[PDB]
């Protein structure tokens, strides 16, 4: 009945913050996470928008690991198609060595068309790409030498240095779909699950995973899945709800824009910004409900519910939605003192 | 007042483990900070034991986390091998994260195996390096960059974050004149390897200045860098023998990286072992390997004829941590304090 507690270092940039502030804040929360006995801190990858300024989780993670001693640092996630597998293999294995095995490489397919256009990748291959790039990296780590004649890359056998410090490279997998869930289950690969998914959908995902493991001759109980959550905690549920709502309204618009960025840079007002929609509003109310946003007891109920139905071992939390540093720290304090003590695990 | 950098090498001689090398390296990173070095420096090597670190950006990123004050440069990022939009993102972030303590070394790379494995034409490498530079620069200065260029084709997109620095601190590996010209033209400091004859680095700097001024840049405002193997010991012939044994392996490994019949192989070991002997004789001559006095003489001469403000030293040749720490202590006390600028 002990949850490993994660902490997102967001590099989202609302209009009312500077790049410096957001990045300094991220660095600072990384140190708060160390001080306050978090299991882990977690990095994101994003390109070309203020949805997130960090486009290299490997570099950011490598920094935070340098700047810390105890805490584990993971990526959520590394978009594998965009990277040569042998490059990321070298990267992860070096950081595993440097970090004395405090690093968790997270992997996913990615879902932004801008990303694949710019780096020159075919967005229809991304499934096969990701599986192949995983296979390649895995062999580099486990065997110490890899080549490819496979469908995407041709290159001869070479050794890839260094070898991991860890027996097995610690990893997670973003997996939203059944075919990925099977693949991960097959490859002994823990899931990390986004925060916008319905709780019973998360329950089903884990059950599906547990089934496919057993079917592919693996112990499901020996894998520890991870969940993302927004936590924003305040005595006055109405106060914190409206703070997060402001943030989340921007967040969902920024998401819309990211899927549109290339067209906007080729273009660049009155009747655009006028034409309330309530489509975003629908999503934001959803997010509030799914996530741990309100009083201590609200958060306890919501967090503990998602543990019960899922049985996840780790919860990676993001505090940023409440605003700037004062408000985040107040939130974090409440959480650490009035919420976290009272959470237990599913077994 | 000379700026001292230190190489965190990750070469693995056969008697060493990967773990030991990488743990030494981190540790020397910490020593560099305490003992008032300006900078620490990381290299990029692939598929070879003559350097383990294939990602200078990761290892640079780590060491900047683990230090307060020291600057960390790379020497060098092999540019052709990485998308310029990705490294733009990387360097700008690390500029922000590190608080402008980062220095992005760039180069062309000359190892064929590398370009084979990452699927790059080794013939195209100079143009790529230049093209890729332009793109990164444009990303940093304007904040948006596309390319219907000769190599990459993608629409204009914003690249985040913006650098912390007003200008991204960089250096450029430059062996050949044509590159030296490009460097200068682009107001780009040089970093020179440790196997260049004294006459030549004189020529390189001269040429640089000449081409710099032509292209309307002030050459005095540019701080060039030179790499130097340091190994300092009372006993000239102990330290020399120690570094000879190491460098024998080293330059042998560098050879293998590029890549009746018992008689034809046995005439390859002798022919190889002399070719390697010749390179290693040069290295001992060119570099600061002897008593404190030998070092002082060699270092100061190299400074005199070049006018470099940054000298980057590597200590690893002399052996393991115990011997390196002895060597580093003599350098600090009996060599360093007796070295002047131009």
XYZ file of C-alpha atoms in Angstrom, chain B:
342
model
C 44.879 35.082 -18.232
C 44.494 31.713 -19.952
C 41.149 29.908 -19.796
C 41.618 26.253 -18.839
C 39.228 23.595 -20.116
C 39.313 19.879 -19.299
C 38.375 16.914 -21.491
C 36.115 14.310 -19.944
C 37.356 11.524 -22.223
C 35.478 8.218 -22.348
C 38.142 6.085 -24.015
C 38.305 2.521 -22.687
C 41.769 0.877 -22.843
C 41.489 -2.931 -22.655
C 42.273 -3.150 -18.934
C 39.398 -0.804 -18.078
C 35.645 -1.296 -17.753
C 33.044 0.980 -19.349
C 31.680 1.685 -15.869
C 35.070 2.763 -14.511
C 35.739 5.100 -17.437
C 32.323 6.754 -17.155
C 32.663 7.069 -13.371
C 36.141 8.575 -13.649
C 34.760 10.979 -16.259
C 31.909 12.228 -14.064
C 34.433 12.533 -11.238
C 36.914 14.596 -13.260
C 33.875 16.712 -14.122
C 33.593 17.439 -10.393
C 37.322 18.106 -10.007
C 37.259 20.539 -12.936
C 34.658 22.556 -11.025
C 36.491 22.621 -7.694
C 39.930 23.376 -9.127
C 38.761 26.466 -10.959
C 38.832 25.252 -14.556
C 36.845 27.485 -16.911
C 35.217 24.626 -18.773
C 34.793 20.896 -19.289
C 34.547 19.284 -22.715
C 32.995 16.142 -24.200
C 33.576 14.319 -27.490
C 31.440 12.247 -29.869
C 32.471 8.757 -30.995
C 30.507 5.782 -32.327
C 30.916 2.021 -32.380
C 34.413 2.180 -30.897
C 36.222 1.921 -27.556
C 38.412 4.946 -28.301
C 35.388 6.866 -27.127
C 32.203 5.588 -25.490
C 30.122 8.774 -25.468
C 28.062 8.826 -28.670
C 25.961 11.753 -27.430
C 27.888 14.866 -26.253
C 24.586 16.708 -25.801
C 23.382 14.212 -23.192
C 26.711 13.981 -21.372
C 27.143 17.757 -21.560
C 23.595 18.158 -20.244
C 24.353 15.872 -17.291
C 27.562 17.623 -16.268
C 25.896 21.047 -16.415
C 23.282 19.746 -13.979
C 26.025 18.443 -11.702
C 27.922 21.749 -11.649
C 27.229 25.361 -10.672
C 29.814 27.557 -12.310
C 31.897 25.672 -14.884
C 31.068 25.957 -18.583
C 30.660 22.781 -20.637
C 31.518 22.552 -24.333
C 31.400 19.758 -26.902
C 34.278 18.890 -29.235
C 32.571 18.175 -31.361
C 28.974 17.604 -32.432
C 29.160 15.729 -35.738
C 26.522 17.830 -37.451
C 25.677 15.800 -40.617
C 24.478 12.977 -38.385
C 21.645 14.852 -36.666
C 18.684 16.899 -37.887
C 19.558 20.614 -37.404
C 16.080 21.413 -36.074
C 16.515 18.769 -33.372
C 19.938 20.005 -32.245
C 18.633 23.572 -32.371
C 15.982 22.496 -29.861
C 18.649 20.694 -27.829
C 21.192 23.513 -27.597
C 18.658 26.290 -26.978
C 17.083 24.297 -24.143
C 20.472 23.503 -22.606
C 21.405 27.168 -22.972
C 18.292 27.991 -20.936
C 18.671 25.106 -18.485
C 22.374 25.737 -17.884
C 22.031 29.530 -17.716
C 24.266 30.214 -20.721
C 27.088 27.931 -19.552
C 26.951 25.734 -22.662
C 29.224 25.831 -25.717
C 28.174 23.924 -28.839
C 31.191 22.561 -30.690
C 30.349 21.628 -34.281
C 32.300 19.686 -36.901
C 32.011 17.624 -40.084
C 33.123 14.207 -38.826
C 35.554 12.101 -40.851
C 34.658 8.540 -39.823
C 33.026 6.591 -42.644
C 31.374 3.956 -40.446
C 29.338 6.739 -38.832
C 27.809 8.087 -42.044
C 27.204 4.528 -43.257
C 25.195 3.531 -40.191
C 23.119 6.706 -39.851
C 22.607 6.712 -43.616
C 24.463 9.863 -44.679
C 26.580 10.501 -47.776
C 30.120 11.153 -46.535
C 30.666 13.100 -49.761
C 28.069 15.720 -48.878
C 29.283 16.372 -45.387
C 30.780 19.856 -45.697
C 27.777 21.349 -47.499
C 25.459 19.619 -45.019
C 27.458 21.003 -42.092
C 27.137 24.522 -43.516
C 23.480 24.166 -44.508
C 22.656 22.692 -41.096
C 24.458 25.549 -39.338
C 22.466 28.157 -41.273
C 19.204 26.482 -40.271
C 20.098 26.289 -36.574
C 21.296 29.904 -36.588
C 18.105 31.027 -38.336
C 16.064 29.107 -35.759
C 17.829 30.865 -32.883
C 17.819 34.402 -34.254
C 14.420 34.631 -35.963
C 12.612 31.927 -33.981
C 11.161 30.316 -37.111
C 12.833 28.268 -39.845
C 11.864 26.275 -42.916
C 13.840 24.660 -45.739
C 13.156 24.083 -49.388
C 16.930 23.674 -49.300
C 19.295 21.260 -51.133
C 19.108 18.575 -48.441
C 16.052 19.063 -46.225
C 12.542 20.088 -47.284
C 10.120 21.228 -44.581
C 7.792 24.257 -44.158
C 8.597 27.193 -41.809
C 7.877 26.342 -38.167
C 8.780 28.063 -34.852
C 11.575 26.374 -32.899
C 11.434 26.624 -29.104
C 12.808 27.567 -26.762
C 14.682 30.744 -27.623
C 18.329 30.749 -26.415
C 19.119 32.304 -23.043
C 22.236 33.820 -24.625
C 21.896 36.763 -27.012
C 24.050 34.600 -29.277
C 24.541 30.830 -29.069
C 28.120 30.186 -27.813
C 29.830 27.885 -30.312
C 33.179 26.665 -31.571
C 34.121 25.053 -34.884
C 36.500 22.200 -35.665
C 38.653 23.368 -38.574
C 41.528 21.372 -40.071
C 41.430 22.437 -43.718
C 41.798 25.987 -45.164
C 38.398 25.962 -46.869
C 36.642 25.375 -43.541
C 38.892 27.836 -41.701
C 37.636 30.372 -44.250
C 34.017 29.444 -43.506
C 34.543 29.619 -39.740
C 36.074 33.094 -39.988
C 33.426 34.266 -42.457
C 30.833 33.287 -39.844
C 32.669 34.843 -36.890
C 33.096 31.322 -35.545
C 35.933 30.507 -33.071
C 38.180 27.553 -33.915
C 38.926 24.528 -31.767
C 42.030 22.636 -32.857
C 42.995 19.016 -32.176
C 46.181 18.068 -30.365
C 48.122 16.553 -33.273
C 48.858 19.706 -35.281
C 52.462 20.757 -35.924
C 53.354 24.095 -34.329
C 54.040 25.683 -37.722
C 50.554 24.785 -38.917
C 48.407 26.175 -36.095
C 50.344 29.410 -36.545
C 49.273 29.276 -40.201
C 45.684 28.375 -39.301
C 45.262 31.367 -36.988
C 47.002 33.743 -39.410
C 44.778 32.544 -42.257
C 41.725 32.869 -40.006
C 42.556 36.455 -39.032
C 43.207 37.412 -42.656
C 39.866 36.039 -43.841
C 38.032 37.311 -40.757
C 39.015 40.948 -41.289
C 38.216 40.688 -45.001
C 34.660 39.639 -44.119
C 34.281 42.595 -41.797
C 34.713 40.761 -38.486
C 37.110 41.768 -35.705
C 39.489 38.790 -35.170
C 40.670 39.996 -31.755
C 37.151 39.538 -30.370
C 37.326 35.805 -31.099
C 38.709 33.263 -28.627
C 40.330 30.230 -30.256
C 40.874 26.898 -28.507
C 43.579 24.219 -28.580
C 43.580 20.644 -27.274
C 46.611 19.335 -25.383
C 47.454 16.006 -23.752
C 48.898 16.754 -20.312
C 50.834 14.210 -18.251
C 53.201 15.633 -15.654
C 55.662 13.678 -13.505
C 59.120 14.175 -11.894
C 60.339 11.085 -13.758
C 60.372 12.087 -17.430
C 60.715 8.554 -18.733
C 58.115 6.953 -16.467
C 55.320 9.322 -17.505
C 56.484 9.151 -21.125
C 56.464 5.343 -21.115
C 53.035 5.367 -19.452
C 51.511 7.638 -22.101
C 53.300 5.791 -24.910
C 51.693 2.487 -23.916
C 48.272 4.143 -23.705
C 48.565 6.043 -26.980
C 49.877 2.963 -28.778
C 46.510 1.346 -28.062
C 44.643 4.600 -28.664
C 45.887 5.338 -32.183
C 45.713 1.624 -32.959
C 42.026 1.777 -32.013
C 41.587 4.888 -34.166
C 42.959 2.871 -37.090
C 40.605 -0.079 -36.592
C 37.701 2.375 -36.379
C 38.259 3.357 -40.018
C 37.826 -0.323 -40.910
C 50.940 -18.038 -47.033
C 48.453 -15.551 -45.566
C 50.267 -15.902 -42.236
C 53.215 -14.121 -43.862
C 50.969 -11.416 -45.329
C 49.359 -10.673 -41.960
C 52.711 -10.733 -40.148
C 53.904 -8.065 -42.589
C 50.829 -6.051 -41.585
C 51.499 -6.063 -37.832
C 55.040 -4.741 -38.315
C 53.960 -2.237 -40.975
C 51.083 -1.114 -38.750
C 53.113 -1.010 -35.540
C 55.639 1.400 -37.062
C 52.993 3.652 -38.623
C 51.395 3.843 -35.170
C 54.811 4.365 -33.572
C 55.311 7.437 -35.769
C 51.999 9.017 -34.745
C 52.747 8.364 -31.071
C 56.220 9.908 -31.323
C 54.566 13.066 -32.667
C 52.026 13.140 -29.839
C 54.691 12.939 -27.124
C 56.626 15.734 -28.840
C 53.666 18.017 -29.525
C 52.016 17.627 -26.137
C 52.817 18.463 -22.525
C 54.181 15.118 -21.332
C 57.164 15.141 -18.975
C 58.353 17.071 -15.925
C 56.575 20.339 -14.941
C 59.339 22.114 -16.867
C 58.741 20.228 -20.123
C 55.026 20.991 -19.809
C 55.557 24.692 -19.087
C 57.858 24.962 -22.106
C 55.504 23.169 -24.495
C 52.258 24.806 -23.373
C 53.622 28.352 -23.389
C 55.162 27.909 -26.841
C 51.846 26.689 -28.263
C 50.135 29.728 -26.736
C 52.804 32.089 -28.073
C 52.566 30.998 -31.702
C 48.768 30.721 -31.768
C 47.411 33.312 -29.330
C 44.666 31.001 -28.049
C 42.802 32.101 -24.917
C 41.385 28.638 -24.210
C 43.535 25.528 -23.776
C 41.728 22.245 -23.111
C 43.752 19.508 -21.424
C 43.239 15.751 -21.165
C 44.802 13.855 -18.284
C 43.624 10.328 -18.918
C 46.630 8.955 -20.792
C 48.762 8.577 -17.678
C 46.592 5.790 -16.252
C 43.752 5.410 -13.748
C 42.261 7.829 -11.219
C 45.145 7.482 -8.752
C 47.761 8.510 -11.323
C 45.582 11.155 -12.986
C 45.048 12.860 -9.623
C 48.803 12.986 -9.015
C 49.293 14.345 -12.538
C 46.501 16.895 -12.071
C 48.052 18.114 -8.812
C 51.481 18.749 -10.338
C 49.867 20.551 -13.276
C 47.871 22.781 -10.937
C 50.735 23.695 -8.634
C 53.935 23.543 -10.655
C 52.802 24.184 -14.240
C 49.529 26.119 -14.403
C 50.733 29.153 -12.365
C 53.573 29.775 -14.830
C 51.618 30.072 -18.087
C 50.835 33.437 -19.682
C 48.677 34.774 -22.516
C 49.818 35.889 -25.951
